Every structure is written in structure tokens, then in C-alpha cells.
């Protein structure tokens, strides 16, 4: 009933009793495991139960469970849902639900920070124009001149029948991807599609590898509007190597603020189709995946050649060598430009403390091993040796379909 979780490096053993709190099924069955898959294949009753449960969680957190306010609040919920089929959250509950959602996110290695989160309430938003206003202040606050601060801005919840508020982009800041001559792609191939949708709704494209995309904000049941972020708002870091003086020539750079904007935030049944959040990057996100993925910037061979390595054979480990320097570059740069950044070694060790804190606080922690273990040097980090249990808890961040 309760899984046994073991750390094969130290021999320690814990029992995950938190999983019993899961009210939603994952992708696996006793016949086969689909844990490595990226993507998974209301009546008054539904909303009500979730809402009540969430309200019970909120009052336990403030040590006033069963109290007077707890009672009246549960009643305000029955009351609102009974006559409108739904309800609304008080600002302090919303703040509790957002932090809780981060806490419950199995694929995030930085949850040690879950408690420090600045929540911006933008549920009184009525147009894509206002959205762009809230987004500009989020970026301005989150970036904080390089000394990054975690934050999230919550826009209006979804309402039955009506169109959702949406941020078409998957990150507030993303470089354009332009399909050219042949199958070739200039810039970031992952953003090819969104780049084309931006050109379709106007926008004079650039012809660079690192052109910051415009934003396509959408208000309910209306076509999306294109807005352009003030360049002084979008902080960037030119990449250079601590010893490889020619690395800087490559003209590589990345944005300082990782701001996910494509996920759905579910709290007590309500669903916030638009709620961009941001913390700060872990160096492998940029150094290994963004720059070395074959279907991304794919700069592995370039830096290899420049390093005078033998790309003729795999056994020379030229791939591995270049990947380490490129990652070193990202770390060196950021620290030099005085912008917040965490290396995969420091991040996974803090994640280990997080597991212990959560073991004492709740009896376990939902974790997706495939995502927690970094893209390079997996076993050189402590999480590789740590067993993990994955399950879905609410509040939660979930993936949702693309607007178009």
C-alpha cells in the first residue's frame, strides 16, 4: 500500500505515505510502465469535492482547521457553487494554491524554493492589452536587474462556455525560428511554428539566430494580439568561455529569465488557463538541451571543431568534451554578468534536502526521475541514485492544448 523508497548510495529507506493523497490516475498500470512518456494519452459534484478538499488544505496550513472561519468559508463555497455552478478564490487562498502547485510538480528540480514565491493577482484583467501590462511588470520584477526572484501572475480563471485567456507563447521570452532556403532553420527550431504565427498576425521578422519573439496574447473568444517587449526589459547574457578566448566569437547568448507561460494551474477545481511563472535557470537547460540538442541550436560539432577535436569517431568522446565546456561557458557568463543561475550539481543536492524536508512534512514527495536527473553527468549527481515515486497531487500545474 505504501511504497518503499531507497537511496542506493547511502542505504537509507523511507516509505511514501503521501501518495495515498492522490485523487487522479497517472499513465501506468500493473501491466506496463509509461513513466518515460512526456505526454499523457463540471457537475456540481466534481467542483464541489475538489473545492472542499482545497479549502480543508488551506485552513490546515494556517492551523485553524475546523475553526469558525473554516466553517463559514466552506459554506460560502456551497452557496456560490449551488447557484452559479462555480466559485471564486480569496487572494490568500490563491497564494496558497499557487505555492502548493509548485510544491506538487513532479518534474521540477528546484522545489526547495517552493515557499518563496511572489504571486501577482491579475484576475481583474479584461483585455490582451492589460495582459501585456501585467506581463511587463512580471518580467520587470522577476528579473530584478539580474538578481532573479521567483514569481507568478495569475489571470482570469476559465468559465464554462466562454473562451480562455491564453498566452500563445510557451515562454514569455523565446528566440525566433525561421525556416529558410531548404529544410534549414535559422535560430531556435523549437519555435518555428509560433514564429510563423507571429508573422501571420503581422510582425516584421528579423533574420538573426537570437531574435526575441513578440508576444501573442489572447483574451476570451477573440483573435490574439501581437505585442512587442521593450528590449530594455529583456535581459540577455553574451556567452564566453573562461579560458577558450575564441568561444565569445561564436556570438552566442541566452535570456536570463525562464518564464513558462503555456501551463495550466488547477486549484480547488478552478483552472487558470493563463498563469506565467518564473524562477531562474539551471545551467543544463541552456548549456545542454537548448544549445546541444540535435533538434535545437545543435552547436556541438561547431564547438568541437573549434576546439580542434576529432569528430570523425564517437570514441574520442568529442561530444562529451564540447558539452562540458559549453555548459562551463553558460555558468561563467551568467556569474560574470551577475545574473542568477544554478548548476546541476548544486540544484540536485538542494533537491535532496527538499526530499528530506518533505519526508518529515508530508511523508513523501512526487518526483519524475527521468526529468529530475540532469541531461549530462547523471550519475555524478545524487538524485541519480535516489528512487522516486510519481503521482498526481492537487493543486497542480498541467499541460493543456495549444490555442490554434
Ligand X SMILES: C[C@H](O)[C@H](O)[C@H]1CNc2nc(N)[nH]c(=O)c2N1
Ligand Y SMILES: C[As](C)(=O)[O-]
**Active-site amino acid positions:** 108, 111, 280, 285
State the DSSP code for 171. Answer: B
286/332 Cα distance (integer angstroms): 13
45/51 Cα distance (integer angstroms): 10
Stretch that binds its own copies, among 108-116, 125-133, 270-278, 323-331 (CB under 8 A): 323-331
Q: Which does 251 bind (CB under 5 to 8 A by kind): ligand HEM, Zn ion, its own copies, none?
A: none
Interface residues toward ligand X, by CB under 6 A: 8, 36, 38, 370-371, 384-387
The answer to whether the annotation marks 28 as part of a ligand binding site is: yes
Q: Quick check: helix, strand or coil at residue 269?
A: coil
Q: Quick check: helix, strand or coil at residue 300?
A: helix
Which of residues 36 and 126 has its CB atom nearest to ligand X in the complex?
Answer: 36
CB 378 within 8 A of CB 384: yes
Least Å distance between CB 43 and its own copies? 20
Least Å distance between CB 343 and ligand D7P? 13
Q: Is residue 279 a contact point for ligand D7P (CB under 6 A)? A: yes
Interface residues toward ligand Y, by CB under 6 A: 246, 306
**b (16+ CB within 10 A) / e for 103-138:** bbbbebbbbbbbeebbbbebbebeebeebbebbbeb
The answer to whether the annotation marks 108 as part of a ligand binding site is: yes
Q: Which does 152 bind (CB under 5 to 8 A by kind): its own copies, ligand HEM, ligand D7P, none?
A: ligand HEM
| Cβ burial, residue 141 (10 Å; 0-12/13-18/19+) | middle
The answer to whether the annotation marks 171 as part of a ligand binding site is: yes
Q: Which does 39 bind (CB under 5 to 8 A by kind): ligand X, ligand D7P, ligand HEM, none?
A: ligand D7P
Q: Which of residues 281-320 bind ligand HEM (CB under 6 A)?
A: 282, 285
The answer to whether the annotation marks 371 as part of a ligand binding site is: yes
Q: Which does 38 bind (CB under 5 to 8 A by kind): ligand D7P, Zn ion, ligand HEM, none?
A: ligand D7P
Contacting residues for 203 by C-beta, under 8 A, at least 6 apart? 214, 226, 228
CB 146 within 8 A of CB 338: yes
Stretch that binds ligand HEM, among 61-69, 159-167, 235-243, 280-288 (CB under 6 A): 280-288
Q: Which does 281 bind (CB under 5 to 8 A by kind): ligand D7P, its own copies, ligand Y, none?
A: ligand D7P
Which of residues 136 and 260 has its CB atom nearest to its own copies in the complex?
Answer: 260
Q: Is residue 152 a contact point for ligand HEM (CB under 6 A)? A: yes
DSSP letters of 203-226?
Answer: -----SSSPBPPEEEE-TTS--EE
86/80 Cα distance (integer angstroms): 6
148/87 Cα distance (integer angstroms): 34
H or E element that contains 149: none
| Cβ burial, residue 172 (10 Å; 0-12/13-18/19+) | buried
Least Å distance between CB 368 and ligand X? 8
Q: Which does 371 bind (CB under 5 to 8 A by kind): Zn ion, ligand D7P, ligand X, none?
A: ligand X
Q: Is residue 192 a contact point for ligand D7P (CB under 6 A)? A: no
The answer to whether the annotation marks 36 as part of a ligand binding site is: yes
Q: Residues in the site for ligand D7P, rule: CB under 6 A?
A: 38-39, 170-171, 258, 260, 277-281, 285, 399
Residues in the annotated binding site: 28, 33, 36, 108, 171, 280-281, 285, 290, 370-371, 384, 399
Amino acid at each position: 500500500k505504501f511504497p518503499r523508497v531507497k537511496n542506493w548510495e547511502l542505504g537509507s529507506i523511507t516509505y511514501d505515505t503521501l501518495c495515498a493523497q492522490s485523487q487522479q490516475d497517472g499513465p501506468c498500470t500493473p501491466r506496463r510502465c509509461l513513466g518515460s512518456l512526456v505526454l499523457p494519452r463540471p457537475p456540481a459534484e466534481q467542483l464541489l469535492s475538489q473545492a472542499r478538499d482545497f479549502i480543508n488544505q488551506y485552513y490546515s496550513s494556517i492551523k485553524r482547521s475546523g475553526s469558525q472561519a473554516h466553517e463559514e468559508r466552506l459554506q460560502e463555497v456551497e452557496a456560490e457553487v449551488a447557484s452559479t455552478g462555480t466559485y471564486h478564490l480569496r487572494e490568500s487562498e490563491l497564494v496558497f494554491g499557487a505555492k502548493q502547485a509548485w510544491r506538487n510538480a513532479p518534474r521540477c528540480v528546484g522545489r526547495i524554493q517552493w515557499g518563496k514565491l511572489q504571486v501577482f493577482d491579475a484576475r481583474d484583467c479584461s483585455s490582451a492589452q492589460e495582459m501585456f501590462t501585467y506581463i511587463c511588470n512580471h518580467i520587470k520584477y522577476a528579473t530584478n536587474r539580474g538578481n532573479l526572484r521567483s514569481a507568478i501572475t495569475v489571470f482570469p480563471q476559465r468559465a464554462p462556455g466562454r473562451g480562455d485567456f491564453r498566452i500563445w507563447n510557451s515562454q514569455l521570452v523565446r528566440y525566433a525560428g525561421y525556416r529558410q532556403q531548404d529544410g534549414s532553420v535559422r535560430g531556435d527550431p523549437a519555435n518555428v511554428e509560433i514564429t510563423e504565427l507571429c508573422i501571420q498576425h503581422g510582425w516584421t521578422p528579423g533574420n538573426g539566430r537570437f531574435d526575441v519573439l513578440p508576444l501573442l496574447l489572447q483574451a476570451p473568444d477573440e483573435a490574439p494580439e501581437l505585442f512587442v517587449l521593450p528590449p530594455e526589459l529583456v535581459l540577455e547574457v553574451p556567452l564566453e568561455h573562461p579560458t577558450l578566448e575564441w568561444f565569445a566569437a561564436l556570438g552566442l547568448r541566452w535570456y536570463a529569465l525562464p518564464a513558462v507561460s503555456n501551463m495550466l494551474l488547477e486549484i480547488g477545481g478552478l483552472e487558470f488557463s493563463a498563469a506565467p511563472f518564473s524562477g531562474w535557470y539551471m545551467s543544463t537547460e541552456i548549456g545542454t538541451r537548448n544549445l546541444c540538442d540535435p533538434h535545437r541550436y545543435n552547436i556541438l560539432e561547431d564547438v568541437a571543431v573549434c576546439m580542434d577535436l576529432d569528430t570523425r569517431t564517437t570514441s574520442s568522446l568529442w561530444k562529451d568534451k564540447a558539452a562540458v565546456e559549453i555548459n562551463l561557458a553558460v555558468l561563467h557568463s551568467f556569474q560574470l554578468a551577475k545574473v542568477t543561475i544554478v548548476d546541476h550539481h548544486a540544484a540536485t543536492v538542494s533537491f535532496m534536502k527538499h526530499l528530506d524536508n518533505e519526508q518529515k512534512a508530508r511523508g513523501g514527495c512526487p518526483a519524475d526521475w527521468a526529468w529530475i536527473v540532469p541531461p549530462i553527468s547523471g550519475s555524478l549527481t545524487p538524485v541519480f541514485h535516489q528512487e522516486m515515486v510519481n503521482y498526481i497531487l492537487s493543486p497542480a500545474f498541467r499541460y493543456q492544448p495549444d490555442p490554434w
